[PDB]
Design a protein around this ligand. Structure first.
Ligand SMILES: OC[C@H]1O[C@@H](O[C@H]2[C@H](O)[C@H](O)[C@H](O[C@H]3[C@H](O)[C@H](O)[C@@H](O)O[C@@H]3CO)O[C@@H]2CO)[C@@H](O)[C@@H](O)[C@@H]1O
Length: 294
């Protein structure tokens, strides 16, 4: 399937793949799948990041639901970055363990799909700014996922709710080395801390890619009440760094400035959605499908 060599992610045809896509809050709106996933593909996204629940905080996504969402993605010519969200911001190892068990439990939905699915082990596990503690978690669990027969590229979110990318700079190679398949990439979520201005965006990207580690900005936003989405897009394009905007629809009121679409079908994008789809360095301009799809 997918493979990582230095700071590049390669598709199953060996062609570099640069993620340009959208997060979708599937776990909380499970019945929107057949509308939302194809609508995201219609915007030119080459990758969808699909929010799943392991039952820790929300309604567990069962094996049939996983199969359903994956299939909707690959049959609309998107790679599926699957992620478990129930450990968000938690420092406790038990929350990471729960996500790891979930992947193992659900392995029969994932095995064989390594050319179209990438596994983001847990959304924003380890909220505190502590690179060592963060690393120790992944060093312990990545070999267990490999032992279970999962050969997918794995995606690991930075510490600090994704906003402490120093963790990846300092310890990301140690994490990568713990993977016996050497097929692990990293993600930063850029909001007001990690994406607060142009210098910060570029330095945070540089501090990973200059360790010869592969990188996606697996979530990012825009200025609210800031966040430099223009530099995230432009510098990502310059450096071949992947990105995934947050999110299609359904944020709670406090975060609803983050909805990219007014409707589930994507007929009415928000200003934010239009920026991501139709603006400079956005999906229409820069998103290329994985060559597994043609
Ligand atoms: O509570 C009933 C209502 O829930 C809706 O799903 C919510 C989830 O339970 C979470 O609370 C979810 O939280 C996310 C926020 O919306 C922001 O996206 C974000 O940054 O992160 C958090 C989680 O980390 O929000 C949704 C929506 O409010 C939904 O399932 C609905 O059907 C139901 O009636």
């Amino acid at each position: 399937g997918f493979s990582v060599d230095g700071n590049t992610l390669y598709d199953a045809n060996g062609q570099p793949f640069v993620m340009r896509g959208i997060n979708h809050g599937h776990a909380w709106y499970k019945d929107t799948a057949s509308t939302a996933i194809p609508a995201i593909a219609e915007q030119g996204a080459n990758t969808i990041r699909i929010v799943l629940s392991d039952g820790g905080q929300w309604e567990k996504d069962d094996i049939d639901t996983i199969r359903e969402v994956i299939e909707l993605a690959e049959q609309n010519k998107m790679v599926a970055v699957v992620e478990v969200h129930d450990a968000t911001g938690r420092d406790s190892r038990s929350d990471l363990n729960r996500a790891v068990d979930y992947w193992i439990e659900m392995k029969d939905a994932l095995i064989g799909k390594e050319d179209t699915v990438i596994i983001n082990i847990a959304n924003e596990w380890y909220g505190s700014w502590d690179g060592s503690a963060w690393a120790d978690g992944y060093i312990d669990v990545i070999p267990k996922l490999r032992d279970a027969g999962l050969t997918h590229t794995l995606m690991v979110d930075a510490a600090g709710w994704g906003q402490y990318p120093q963790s990846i700079h300092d310890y990301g190679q140690d994490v990568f080395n713990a993977d016996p398949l050497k097929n692990t990439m990293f993600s930063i979520h850029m909001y007001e801390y990690a994406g607060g201005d142009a210098n910060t965006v570029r330095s945070n990207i540089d501090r990973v890619i200059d360790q010869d580690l592969a990188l996606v900005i697996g979530e990012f936003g825009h200025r609210h009440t800031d966040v430099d989405e223009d530099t995230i897009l432009s510098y990502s394009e310059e450096t071949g760094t992947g990105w995934l905007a947050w999110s299609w629809k359904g944020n709670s009121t406090s975060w609803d400035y983050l909805d990219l679409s007014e409707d589930w079908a994507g007929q009415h994008l928000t200003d934010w959605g239009n920026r991501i789809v139709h603006g400079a360095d956005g999906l229409q301009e820069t998103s290329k499908p994985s060559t597994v799809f043609t």
